[model samples]
Target: KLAFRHHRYDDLVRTLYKVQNECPGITRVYSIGRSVEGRHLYVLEFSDHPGIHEPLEPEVKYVGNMHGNEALGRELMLQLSEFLCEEFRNRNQRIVQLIQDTRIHILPSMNPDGYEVAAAQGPNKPGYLVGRNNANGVDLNRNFPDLNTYIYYNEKYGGPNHHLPLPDNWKSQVEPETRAVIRWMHSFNFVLSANLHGGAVVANYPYDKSFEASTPTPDDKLFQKLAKVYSYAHGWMFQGWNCGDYFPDGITNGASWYSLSKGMQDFNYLHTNCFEITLELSCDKFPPEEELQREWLGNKEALIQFLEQVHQGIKGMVLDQNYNNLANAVISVSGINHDVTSGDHGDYFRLLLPGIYTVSATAPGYDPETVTVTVGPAEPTLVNFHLKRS
Candidate 1:
């Protein structure tokens, strides 16, 4: 019933806590940061072992209401949360297995301050840009560091495409919501992410800044496949006709469709171990309240299946001879320009298509190790690194 209607800020918070109460063992709610108006950026996390990182389990996230006015995603997140909790309680096999194998995080609102502005107006008469920006009147989606530009200009000459450094003046340029999300990205070793939106119906994948040409990430094919998985699962997204626009397979490259710098999706790819895509889930930015139920129905399957993509790649731990986990070790694969580092738990997850790869790991003062791994269509291929002190 929560998904059948939109929840105001207070209602949203209460609903999430209620879900936690219903399934406290598998659920936990915490704040990443706050908004300009000081609203907490709440994140509800789900895992078999809540509050602790488990080895080889990929961390996945779903971010909604970044624009605030694009409200469909906001409601969908609440529904998904409730659905996951209830399904787990019912002992549904798929839900049980997913929760048992992966760590899922859902941020239902990123711009609560802006959402207040838009929600006050109601859905009958929506103002296109009314609550799109944060309380500070900044677009949170565009407030991240312009990492795509740096990666674009220095393709070969620059550093590895992963974990790019933030600029010295980055703090001055971004809003509170943006800063919170940036910090959250670094806090988790997320393998996959999706920021939900409205006003279109397509899965838009990374390198949002093109610089006048099509910009695709090193895992472009894998990204496209991932996007297609979501689109194809949706009731009508795979049809390619949405909001008077056409996107083949209901998927499009972020830059090829158009160009925008400082997008969160591009930042996740270049600045962290997360592969993020912007999901335009609805044609109407603020659909009427009656549409909430239908919207949730159309998106539930897509949401769960898209999250399953996190298990498609490779994952393992980097440990020393004494069986101690090594932190911040670089994990690289041959033929892919990007590299993901080991997490605080000495575990790393790298998203890759099914193929043979020469995977390697390196840490300072330790001897590097390499292994040839074959990523398959089933569970993620496990490849651990045991480095020796140099």
Candidate 2:
């Protein structure tokens, strides 16, 4: 059964638990962490094979609720979980194949503590919809330890006391839910991740530290390409601004610069080496049932397309000219043929049909490298190279 067209918090959890039990093989519950109210932050894992474990093959994750009040994000996640689990057997062959081929991790609620606060506060309340912060009133979305730069309200809305370094008393990470998810993320080799949000329908890719339109990571082109594909697939308008272009208040002062503190996307990219995307799902903080349903319809094909694309290879690694590892190097593959960097070990992987590819890599201290590589279905060719340091 699907979730209630409109459901309360308790009902939503119960429905999810029931679904988890019915599809135990492809779907099982795991507590990434807990909310302030002690609610379990649950994840529903979907893979091509039922016997797979936590670190599923080709792991990819879709996370929601960094901002607790973004109810639609959580709802959409719940909908996707229910659809994938229930339809894994008969209704959709593509979905069925996806389960059998890839490991898709769905975390329906990331900030349950803040969610509960938002729920208790109810719809339309001043701060009821303002559940962006945690129970302690800290914006969990901005609480990521790595993304913290200068102390700002949007960066850390709970005030000066909250700006203390991570694991500190002020921002204890004391919050079990945040701790759990962070730990889980660190433990897994997630290849790709997306943090879902609302208040706008935009596919916000990385390098959001400033509005100067710069990306800290090396895969800016790849990020834009994927963003464009997602936008087109979902029929949403693509706003081509980079991390440097996002100035919330249009303030030009350098001090007013949007600092990239320790955020989930940044942390994942920098530490875990996963390509992450921050997806703002809709303009309404709490979208109506009809709007939510419409969004689901609009995004169903796009979501599936995005997931399938992830399973298909389009990534490799960047190396020094002598073929040694080059940390923080950017690699990109594009044209009719597309692929990017490999995993942490400098290995490249991509799922593309038989074709010729132009692959390139560059880093701050290294000369750019580009070459033509051939790809086929059987024995996917390994196209490795090195770049000379400038």
The superposed Cα distance between candidate 2 and the true structure at residue 35, in angstroms, equals 2.1
In model 2, the Cα lDDT at residue 247 comes to 28
lDDT of each model, Cα atoms only?
0.89, 0.62
Superposition error at 65 for model 2 (Å): 1.5
- After superposing candidate 1, which stretches have Cα over 4 Å from the reference? 122-124
Backbone clashes in model 1: 0
RMSD of each: 1.3, 8.6
Residue-level lDDT of model 2, residues 1-390, one tens digit each, is: 573354556766786787777777777666776677777877877764543533214667888877877877788878887778767755578888777767788887888777666665645332435677877777765666653243223233433211133444524653566677777866565677778877666676656565333433345555665655566677453443323354222112111234455567765654454667777666666666667678777777767776765654344455777776654455556542212344445555444555677877777777888888876644445555577878
**lDDT (10s digit) by residue, model 1, range 1-390:** 464877889999999999999989999999999899889999999998999888788899999999989888888999999999999989998998999999999999999998889988754345788889988889987888888767776675766667889999887789999999888887888989999999999999987887666788888998999999999999899999999999999999998999988889998888988999999988888888888888888889999999988888888899987989999999999888888899998999888888899999999899889999998988887789999989
lDDT computed for candidate 2: 0.62
Leading candidate by TM-score: 1
What is the model-wide C-alpha lDDT for candidate 1? 0.89
